[PDB]
């Protein structure tokens, strides 16, 4: 099955051979999950034209402004190495399986945020399914989302700190789904951000 990608304002099917040729031509494939307006993904594409930068978000309309920009000629802000895909991470199409050298989840919200905080299987499986073995997962959550008014998707959950990553069982759920936690830290810029890094391996018990 072909991927559903933005070309400017319209959803299209990506030729499976063009997708394959694009991956092989790249020095690294970065999959940015929940890319939002995709401006961060576009910046990365522009700074590393040797990377294939794949932004994944179900809310595809929000990405269209960046897509229009990425599709212009090179001299006018074009980024042909940026591929934006309409999909939710938990139902990620087969053509995205095993592609990524690096998976980033930067300031998620909604299902993606609750999923990573709880370690929901469907979200963590989807994230794992897009990674090559050995790829890093890099998650950043701003801890100010836990100050009032707290958003609905994490209202009922205690604030995620290095200590609760452990005591809620989140490193164990990660391990059961093929993610080995390599590092967690809180970085004070000034909003404090929680960073979690894991590496794609075989599932454990
Ligand atoms: C504001 S954005 C973050 C933008 C970007 N990551 C950044 O640099 O700040 C949060 C995104 O996570 C996305 N999201 C929520 N649930 C998701 C899911 N299940 N799969 C993929 N993305 C999802 C939302 O649609 C939203 O666009």
Author numbering: 5 to 193, 212 to 227
From the primary publication:
However, exceptionally high-level aminoglycoside-resistance is achieved by the action of intrinsic and acquired 16S ribosomal RNA (rRNA) methyltransferase enzymes in aminoglycoside-producing and human pathogenic bacteria, respectively. These resistance determinants block drug binding by catalyzing the transfer of a methyl group from their cosubstrate S-adenosyl-l-methionine (SAM) to the base of a defined target RNA nucleotide within the ribosomal A-site. Here, we describe detailed structural and functional analyses of one of these enzymes, the kanamycin-resistance methyltransferase from Catenulisporales acidiphilia (‘CacKam’). CacKam has a SAM-binding core fold comprised of a seven-stranded β-sheet with a central topological switch point, characteristic of Class I methyltransferases.
